[PDB]
């Protein structure tokens, strides 16, 4: 798809592409706004239509060009044109510098028609109820945005919910020994792979002690 050369509306006064329209106060507010949206189309007959900004208009038998402040007005006019069997209309966003961005028929095929090369953006692979609970994701990446969680996080919190209901079989986290641990950070033994072995043996000692203590009055 080739973007056209839509000029800035303040530099294209009196263009032959402009349809005959009455002109109202509803048009884009100059002297305060510099971002304009332009919609172009090619018609077959001078059929009267309604401008999104109040007032009616008559197309041209050839090319047409209109400028609007908002993309919504351009899309409304596009739907109105498409109701009149007028395809091949393109909607551009004009930056303040004059950069032309091609917006509505982005890949050249209207969004209601399946086109190859598209990928489901903002897709979630479950029913809407499958979203994780907001309470589970507190102070994580998804603090108040449980609907933004990746499906792996949703499954992880679901498994956590499943686990944290069998209370008797849970493992209480041992209380840290603050007074005798906690040396200066430079005082470490390195041996990271040995540190997990130390984790294993210390947790084994904790579990054995807990079992021995429980097997006294239970």
């Amino acid at each position: 798809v080739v973007a056209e050369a839509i000029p800035r509306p303040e530099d294209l006064l009196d263009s032959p592409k402009f349809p005959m329209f009455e002109g109202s106060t509803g048009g884009y507010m100059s002297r305060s706004t510099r971002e304009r949206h332009a919609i172009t189309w090619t018609a077959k007959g001078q059929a009267k239509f309604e401008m999104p900004t109040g007032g009616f208009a008559i197309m041209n038998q050839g090319e047409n060009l209109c400028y609007f402040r908002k993309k919504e007005q351009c899309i409304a006019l596009g739907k109105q044109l498409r109701k009149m069997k007028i395809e091949n209309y393109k909607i551009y966003r004009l930056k303040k510098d004059g950069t032309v961005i091609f917006m509505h028929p982005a890949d050249g095929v209207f969004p209601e028609k399946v086109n190859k090369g598209r990928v489901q953006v903002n897709g979630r692979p479950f029913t809407i109820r499958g979203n994780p609970q907001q309470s589970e994701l507190k102070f994580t990446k998804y603090q108040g945005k449980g609907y933004e969680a990746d499906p792996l996080t949703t499954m992880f919190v679901k498994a956590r919910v499943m686990a944290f209901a069998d209370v008797p079989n849970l493992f209480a986290l041992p209380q840290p020994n603050m007074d005798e641990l906690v040396p200066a950070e430079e005082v470490d033994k390195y041996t990271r792979q040995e540190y997990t072995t130390r984790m294993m043996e210390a947790l084994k000692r904790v579990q054995d002690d807990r079992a021995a203590k429980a097997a006294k009055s239970l």
């Binding site: 498994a159 956590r160 686990a163 209480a172 009055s217």
Partner: protein, 66 residues
């Protein structure tokens, strides 16, 4: 082979069944697993077998029923 929705659901079930058992163990360390949180205190199990364990009655756990 292509991953049918049934196969994805099977992976969901396998992952959940494995992880729900793994997180109960001594290798997950969640704040909800602290003392005073959901899990029982280390040496003082309150409810087992759906029956109040002897540790419920505190210092009376050593007393006889009679």
């Amino acid at each position: 082979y292509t991953e049918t929705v049934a196969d994805e659901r099977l992976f969901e079930q396998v992952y959940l069944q494995y992880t729900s058992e793994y997180l109960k163990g001594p290798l997950y360390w969640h704040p909800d697993k602290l003392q005073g949180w959901l899990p029982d205190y280390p040496g003082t199990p309150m409810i087992k077998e759906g029956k109040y364990t002897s540790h419920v009655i505190g210092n009376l756990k050593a007393f006889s029923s009679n």
